Amino acid sequence: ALLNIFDIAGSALAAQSKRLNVAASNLANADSVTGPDGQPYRAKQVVFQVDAAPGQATGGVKVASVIESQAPEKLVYEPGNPLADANGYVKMPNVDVVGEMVNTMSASRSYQANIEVLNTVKSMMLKTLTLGQ
């Protein structure tokens, strides 16, 4: 059925947009020292998984949740900082800059691929309506 392709590709587009948004947020806040609660900015990551509940193996993509990374927060020595711990260490984000740049580019590419899939399926469905004049 070509109609379900609309839902599949729309889900893919939304998920990749969310992934690119997460990557952009990580890139922007790579040097943030604090948040509103005084906690360091932890790198965010989306969780991709299929959505084929009505008895299928393939159904597209959906973002289950956004999770903060468990890699070690970078400790910088600064004793004058109000946020420094007992040893004088301040926690800083664990953002991987090269990783987030590659994530941005890859998300853009797969987003574009899904755009092309949607356009092709729309063209095919348009051509179908002229079956036998």
């Binding site: 853009s108 356009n119 063209s123």
Partner: protein, 49 residues
Amino acid sequence: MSGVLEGSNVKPVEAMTDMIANARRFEMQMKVITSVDENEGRANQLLSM
């Protein structure tokens, strides 16, 4: 202490490092902006027919 004058406490190493980080952080923001702008065009073209 009389007979001495206190100058500024600007650290040059910190300022230079901060300026380098600022420049190379902007460039990345400009790359992301360009990527999103390029992405939006094909999404806009999706609305045809």
